[PDB]
């Protein structure tokens, strides 16, 4: 008979199902998964700079609570904050906590610059058994607890720090809250006390809270922490008739702030990756991931789907 030539295409025994606009189950010869659904059980310490807070969350790091000394001088792209972090110092709150946490994290460094504050006649360096350092009663190492003199004097304090440097300064300060009027007067003769902090374009007044409170770390007393950013050319004025927890200097702010924080228990390993989730680092080239919406660095985009297969071959029709 006459010769015959047939044109055709390849096939395999069993291909991969993909979706199209029309059909939702079409078999093709090859396909590639586009959703990353696997993570590493560790965080990669390179190429991004990670700082592990360990026992100390970022706020206690800034205040200088006991156990947070490894964080002095630290610089990070991503601060790794541990869910099992523990308080080690005086019972405290921060009225706009998340905002201060954001600022510290985003700034990306703990660079403290000590200054001499010439407090008048009041005694300095008050300590507590709720804040033991090396088994000895102590305090936040960035703060200076002021109380009245031995001759029962807590006069109006009034000092100024002038920013003539080339960087914005972050001052963290506090206000102590006794449990009774007697305690108030016993610590700072005046009642009420009061803290007033001002800059060129802002001024704040805090009136101390006095009331019985649950025992935290053995105490009913509290400190509330505040902060003031002082731009170059501006300055800060501290005023007190009592209850001030004074700063021992300021933290330096980077002009450009591009770091962040990641709260996770995942251990830091020895792998290489620029994408970190709260479940661990991703090591992938896929455009999407379904592991966590919490993702930092150079990451695939988070989606709800567990799988999306991209066809990389023709329809598979075996036999």
């Amino acid at each position: 008979g006459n010769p015959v030539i047939c044109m055709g295409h390849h096939a395999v025994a069993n291909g991969t199902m993909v979706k199209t606009l029309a059909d939702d189950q079409v078999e093709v010869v090859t396909a590639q998964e586009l959703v990353e659904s696997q993570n590493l059980p560790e965080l990669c310490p390179s190429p991004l700079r990670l700082v592990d807070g360990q026992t100390c969350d970022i706020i206690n790091g800034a205040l200088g609570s006991p156990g947070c000394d490894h964080l002095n001088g630290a610089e990070w792209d991503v601060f790794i904050e541990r869910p099992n972090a523990v308080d080690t110092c005086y019972p405290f709150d921060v009225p706009e906590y998340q905002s201060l946490r954001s600022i510290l994290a985003n700034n990306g460094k703990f660079e403290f610059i000590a200054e001499e504050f010439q407090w008048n006649t009041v005694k300095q360096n008050g300590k507590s058994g709720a804040c033991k350092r090396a088994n000895v009663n102590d305090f936040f190492n960035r703060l200076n607890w002021l109380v009245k003199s031995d001759g029962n004097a807590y006069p109006l304090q009034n000092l100024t720090k002038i920013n003539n440097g080339d960087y914005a300064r972050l001052y963290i300060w506090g206000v102590h809250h006794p449990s009774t009027d007697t305690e108030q007067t016993n610590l700072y003769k005046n009642n009420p006390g009061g803290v007033t902090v001002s800059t060129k374009t802002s001024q704040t007044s805090v009136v101390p809270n006095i009331g019985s409170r649950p025992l935290v770390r053995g105490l009913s007393g509290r400190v509330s922490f505040y902060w003031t950013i002082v731009e170059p050319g501006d300055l800060i004025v501290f005023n007190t008739i009592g209850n001030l927890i004074a700063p021992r200097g300021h933290y330096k702010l980077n002009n450009q702030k591009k770091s962040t924080i990641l709260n996770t228990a995942i251990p830091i390993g020895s792998c290489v990756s620029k994408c970190h989730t709260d479940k661990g680092s991703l090591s992938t080239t896929k455009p999407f991931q379904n592991i966590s919406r919490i993702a930092v660095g150079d990451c695939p985009r988070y989606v709800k789907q567990g799988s999306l297969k991209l066809a990389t071959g023709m329809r598979n029709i075996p036999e």
Binding site: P3, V4, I5, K258, A311, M314, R315
Partner: protein, 172 residues
């Protein structure tokens, strides 16, 4: 697919074709053979890997964002933070779903197309010397030994050489 070749007038693929995506299968007086076509194969692959590469680096380098997990309800600001993130995820999940469906629809049409181009290329080489049998095959109306077949596969087949023999076989 749009051209109706693959899963169409070509009934099935060839599992024995292992060194290409498309190819030729022949029968003549001295035997049978299957050979891959490189040009059609490379054209399909080039278009598919092209998609792959465009896909696998847009830039998503993000550091400081917003909180996305919360312990207790807070009200207004927390509601907005959660709504913004949920809004973002739905839109990106929609993008991902549509993207894969469009790409796959196109990929399948591209491969069906490249199969048809190969068929048409060969049809044109053969001129009046062959007839389409309807299944992706041509009946060749002249003796075509292994060298002849190879000439068709490599695009040096000169239809004029066999035309008188073929016309006579076709129409009488």
């Amino acid at each position: 697919g749009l051209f109706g070749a693959i899963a169409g007038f070509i009934e099935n693929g060839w599992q024995g074709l292992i060194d290409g995506w498309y190819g030729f299968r022949h029968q003549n007086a001295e035997g049978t053979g299957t050979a891959a076509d490189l040009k059609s194969t490379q054209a399909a692959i080039d278009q598919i890997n092209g998609k792959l590469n465009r896909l696998i680096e847009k830039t998503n380098d993000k550091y400081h964002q917003i909180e996305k997990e919360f312990e207790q309800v807070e009200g207004r600001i927390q509601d907005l933070e959660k709504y913004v993130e949920d809004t973002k995820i739905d839109l990106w999940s929609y993008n991902a779903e549509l993207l894969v469906a469009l790409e796959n629809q196109h990929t399948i049409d591209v491969t069906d197309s490249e199969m048809n181009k190969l068929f048409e290329r060969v049809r044109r080489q053969l001129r009046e010397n062959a007839e389409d049998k309807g299944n992706g095959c041509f009946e060749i109306f002249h003796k075509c030994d292994n060298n002849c077949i190879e000439s068709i596969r490599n695009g040096t087949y000169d239809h004029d050489i066999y035309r008188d023999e073929a016309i006579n076989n076709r129409f009488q």
